[PDB]
């Protein structure tokens, strides 16, 4: 992460760590959520904390909080990277990747494929039978 990002996350952490002791407990997470107009149960708060408490000591320190934010940012970036790739493959912007578009963009990526090979790729990913690859069909492949 950048210095900047670490700084914004340190500010956020400080808002949860009400007593300033360096860790966020389930009670402090309760106090933050109620201050936002929410009202979780104690079981729900233990469950939310469990997902972020990497070492299992029951509370969340700043390295664990930063690890949660870094993984959230990476998930958002991977999703954006796959969307951007789809928009680059869909050269005419109609929302579908055709066999001709896929053959052409693979050459830009350094792969010279035959029309039969690209047509096999289209049929493997084309789960609705329209002969083109739509965005969700593309995501399915890039996630497998
Ligand atoms: Ca604390
Ligand atoms: Ca911990
Ligand atoms: Ca297209
Ligand atoms: Ca399709």
Q: Are 125 and 139 in the same domain?
A: yes
Instruction: Give the list of residues 6+ apart from residue 72 with CB closer than 8 angstroms, or none.
Output: none
Last residue of a domain, one of 60, 77, 94: 77
107 annotated as a binding-site residue: no
Q: Are 96 and 71 in the same domain?
A: no
57 annotated as a binding-site residue: yes
115 annotated as a binding-site residue: no
Distance set, CA 122 to CA 38, 68, 78, 133 (Å): 47, 37, 23, 6
Determination technique used: X-ray
Q: What is the resolution of this structure in A?
A: 1.5
The pair of three-digit structure tokens given for residue 76, joined into one six-digit string:
């958002």
Domain range for 41 is 2-77
Closest ligand to C-alpha of residue 19 is 1
5 annotated as a binding-site residue: no
Centre of ligand 3 from the C-alpha of residue 87, in Å: 9
Cβ(122)–Cβ(133) below 8 Å: yes
CATH number at residue 38: 1.10.238.10
CA distance 9 to 77: 17
Q: What is the 3-state secondary structure (H, E, C) of the chain?
A: CCHHHHHHHHHHHHHHCCCCCCEECHHHHHHHHHHCCCCCCHHHHHHHHHHHCCCCCCCEEHHHHHHHHHHHHHHHHHHHHHHHHHHHHCCCCCCEECHHHHHHHHHHCCCCCCHHHHHHHHHHHCCCCCCCEEHHHHHHHHHC
Cβ(54)–Cβ(67) below 8 Å: yes
Total structural domains within the chain: 2
Q: Are 39 and 69 in the same domain?
A: yes
Closest ligand to C-alpha of residue 135 is 4
């Amino acid at each position: 992460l950048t210095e900047e990002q670490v700084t914004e996350f340190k500010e956020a952490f400080s808002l949860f760590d009400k007593d300033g002791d360096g860790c966020i407990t389930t009670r402090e997470l309760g106090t933050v959520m109620r201050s936002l107009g929410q009202n979780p149960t104690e079981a729900e708060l233990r469950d939310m904390m469990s997902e972020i408490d990497r070492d299992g000591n029951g509370t969340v320190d700043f390295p664990e909080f930063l690890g949660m934010m870094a993984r959230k940012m990476k998930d958002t970036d991977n999703e954006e990277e796959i969307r951007e790739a789809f928009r680059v493959f869909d050269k005419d912007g109609n929302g579908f990747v055709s066999a001709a578009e896929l053959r052409h963009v693979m050459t830009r990526l350094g792969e010279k494929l035959s029309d039969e090979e690209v047509d096999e790729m289209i049929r493997a990913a084309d789960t609705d039978g329209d002969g083109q690859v739509n965005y969700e069909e593309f995501v399915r492949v890039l996630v497998s």
